[PDB]
Amino acid sequence: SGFRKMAFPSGKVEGCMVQVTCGTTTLNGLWLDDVVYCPRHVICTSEDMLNPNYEDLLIRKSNHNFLVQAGNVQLRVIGHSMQNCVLKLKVDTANPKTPKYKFVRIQPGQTFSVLACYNGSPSGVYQCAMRPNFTIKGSFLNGSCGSVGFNIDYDCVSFCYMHHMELPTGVHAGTDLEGNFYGPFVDRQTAQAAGTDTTITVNVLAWLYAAVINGDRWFLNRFTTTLNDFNLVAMKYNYEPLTQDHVDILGPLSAQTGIAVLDMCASLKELLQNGMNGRTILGSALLEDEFTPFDVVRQCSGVT
Amino acid sequence: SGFRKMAFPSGKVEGCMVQVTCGTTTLNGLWLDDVVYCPRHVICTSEDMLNPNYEDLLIRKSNHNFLVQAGNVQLRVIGHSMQNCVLKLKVDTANPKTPKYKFVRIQPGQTFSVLACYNGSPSGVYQCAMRPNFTIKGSFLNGSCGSVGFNIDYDCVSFCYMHHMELPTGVHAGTDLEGNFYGPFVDRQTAQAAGTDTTITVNVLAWLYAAVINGDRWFLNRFTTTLNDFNLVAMKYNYEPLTQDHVDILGPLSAQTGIAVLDMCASLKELLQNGMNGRTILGSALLEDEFTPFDVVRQCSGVT
Ligand SMILES: *CC(=O)Nc1cccc(C(=O)N2CCSCC2)c1
Numbered sequence: 001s002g003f004r005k006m007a008f009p010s011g012k013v014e015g016c017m018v019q020v021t022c023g024t025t026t027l028n029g030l031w032l033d034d035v036v037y038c039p040r041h042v043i044c045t046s047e048d049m050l051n052p053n054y055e056d057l058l059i060r061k062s063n064h065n066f067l068v069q070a071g072n073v074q075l076r077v078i079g080h081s082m083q084n085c086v087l088k089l090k091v092d093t094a095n096p097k098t099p100k101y102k103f104v105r106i107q108p109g110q111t112f113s114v115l116a117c118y119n120g121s122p123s124g125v126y127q128c129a130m131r132p133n134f135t136i137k138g139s140f141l142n143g144s145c146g147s148v149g150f151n152i153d154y155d156c157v158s159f160c161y162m163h164h165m166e167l168p169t170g171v172h173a174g175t176d177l178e179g180n181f182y183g184p185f186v187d188r189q190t191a192q193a194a195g196t197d198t199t200i201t202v203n204v205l206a207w208l209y210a211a212v213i214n215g216d217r218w219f220l221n222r223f224t225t226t227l228n229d230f231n232l233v234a235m236k237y238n239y240e241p242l243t244q245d246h247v248d249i250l251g252p253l254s255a256q257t258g259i260a261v262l263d264m265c266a267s268l269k270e271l272l273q274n275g276m277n278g279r280t281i282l283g284s285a286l287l288e289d290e291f292t293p294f295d296v297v298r299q300c301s302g303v304t
Numbered sequence: 305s306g307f308r309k310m311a312f313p314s315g316k317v318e319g320c321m322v323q324v325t326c327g328t329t330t331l332n333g334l335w336l337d338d339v340v341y342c343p344r345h346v347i348c349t350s351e352d353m354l355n356p357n358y359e360d361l362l363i364r365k366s367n368h369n370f371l372v373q374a375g376n377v378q379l380r381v382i383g384h385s386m387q388n389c390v391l392k393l394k395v396d397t398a399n400p401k402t403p404k405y406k407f408v409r410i411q412p413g414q415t416f417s418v419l420a421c422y423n424g425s426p427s428g429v430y431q432c433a434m435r436p437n438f439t440i441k442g443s444f445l446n447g448s449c450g451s452v453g454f455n456i457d458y459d460c461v462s463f464c465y466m467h468h469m470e471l472p473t474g475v476h477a478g479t480d481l482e483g484n485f486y487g488p489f490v491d492r493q494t495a496q497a498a499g500t501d502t503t504i505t506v507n508v509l510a511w512l513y514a515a516v517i518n519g520d521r522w523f524l525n526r527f528t529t530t531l532n533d534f535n536l537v538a539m540k541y542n543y544e545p546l547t548q549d550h551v552d553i554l555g556p557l558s559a560q561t562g563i564a565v566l567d568m569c570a571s572l573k574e575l576l577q578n579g580m581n582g583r584t585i586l587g588s589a590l591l592e593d594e595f596t597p598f599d600v601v602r603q604c605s606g607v608t
Pocket residue numbers: 024025026027039046141142143144145146164
């Protein structure tokens with residue numbers, strides 16, 4: 001029993017983190033096989049970042065200008081290229097700790113673990129969600145970019161995020177490992193405002209199911225609703241619209257608890273309309289939305 | 305910027321987890337040097353757990369009755385002993401992945417990372433605190449006991465917790481790695497009620513400092529208080545008494561923010577008396593108490 005905001009064990013990713021230095025800029029890189037992936041803004045001075053021309057800046061850079069250090073050992077860079085907003089540094093040594101891995105581009109509402117790193121050294125691990133506005137709410141100080149987000153399926157690490165920037169509102173933007181930003185953000189020190197940070201409804205419902213499984217039941221009510229009725233209330237409260245696809249995804253939790261998805265929607269509707277009245281659910285005073293239905297099943301069933 | 309409930313990177317501990325089987329009971333063990341540590345209730349049937357005599361049960365057990373499996377390779381058990389509520393299984397092979405480590409007995413209010421494991425396989429990592437009632441609020445299913453809690457100082461893992469039991473209220477009890485339970489709990493399936501789960505005041509204040517550092521400032525007020533005045537309010541709200549030792553520990557955060565500890569106490573007092581009025585602090589609707597002052601400095605300064 002109990003339900004925690006749980007990250008994947010980070011060891012497989014720890015074994016991939018390196019330091020990348022270009023001139024006076026140092027950040028983190030991801031070493032998989034004989035390639036090191038890092039944000040392309042490693043080539044920028046803070047001055048460059050106001051309006052960088054990355055292709056032009058890269059012309060001034062040779063293989064020997066990219067210093068890659070794995071622990072306290074230097075890797076030899078034998079090639080470099082820019083793919084979207086990442087650099088790929090070819091090194092002469094395959095990472096001996098390379099796990100089975102994939103690159104995945106996640107959808108908003110999907111959760112992942114971040115291994116926060118500084119100078120290629122792991123500092124901490126925490127669980128994030130891709131927000132509906134394609135930001136994440138992370139914990140990233142100076143030196144953290146190139147820190148990665150990932151999911152693990154048994155022995156395969158799916159990398160989904162590399163950290164690039166902090167918006168002036170202190171929320172975070174980054175890329176997949178093909179170097180494509182999530183959302184409309186660019187690797188430039190300019191005006192970039194996030195859109196509405198809406199609540200991930202399907203995740204809230206998953207977490208209400210988790211609450212019921214773990215004995216938090218006070219919010220279960222006598223009501224049901226319809227997708228369209230629920231969605232009117234969702235709209236009012238800046239919750240994402242619930243689709244039949246979301247209902248289908250919650251089916252296993254519905255089955256386990258015997259609470260129809262639309263009944264849990266009606267419970268959520270009343271919580272939105274009535275508030276918590278100073279009560280808590282799984283130790284939270286707000287409705288948690290950074291657990292996916294898959295997360296709730298995993299943690300409630302004990303997958304490794 | 306940003307502030308997250310962050311665990312230590314778990315790789316060093318992942319390399320220590322093994323499966324221990326005695327008859328039909330399987331749980332987790334910690335392999336350091338040539339010793340495997342595990343809960344002594346590995347020798348019990350669920351029936352035994354009603355009123356176990358561990359010394360008597362252990363007489364029926366030989367080295368060859370303890371099956372220890374590290375990945376898919378079996379370790380040879382050449383010795384076993386009971387120390388308090390843990391078994392120490394001597395194996396013929398030193399764990400080649402043994403990190404620098406210590407065993408520490410933590411005090412209530414101290415935080416640590418848990419690597420939740422099943423059959424010696426890591427499932428997840430999360431951050432906990434030793435509650436003032438010597439419970440932890442974990443996420444532990446059947447098969448999770450022998451999962452460990454730890455802090456990391458650079459390259460040294462300090463192990464502070466091994467999971468043993470779930471109280472009927474779904475909170476968790478366990479031992480240090482010398483096998484001594486935190487608090488009054490025993491490894492028996494009997495009536496064990498937890499005491500008052502009081503709020504760790506010094507940790508709340510640390511987290512208010514973290515909030516100010518990260519731009520959440522709405523709760524800063526025009527007031528100050530005294531330790532004795534604050535403590536009257538703390539008592540009313542089931543908060544731990546604040547001592548001058550706690551004030552001294554918050555000095556660096558006081559210095560960084562320029563907010564006197566007693567001024568932040570006065571802010572906390574008003575939050576206790578007035579509530580949040582539907583506002584949030586660092587994405588929480590309640591006052592978070594599972595960050596230590598050391599945690600806030602670490603995460604706000606980016607230690608690896
Ligand atoms: C991605 C990231 O962290 N960018 C960055 C921005 C400014 C400065 C640096 C940098 O090189 N350092 C090393 C010295 S201490 C500050 C971080 C990186």
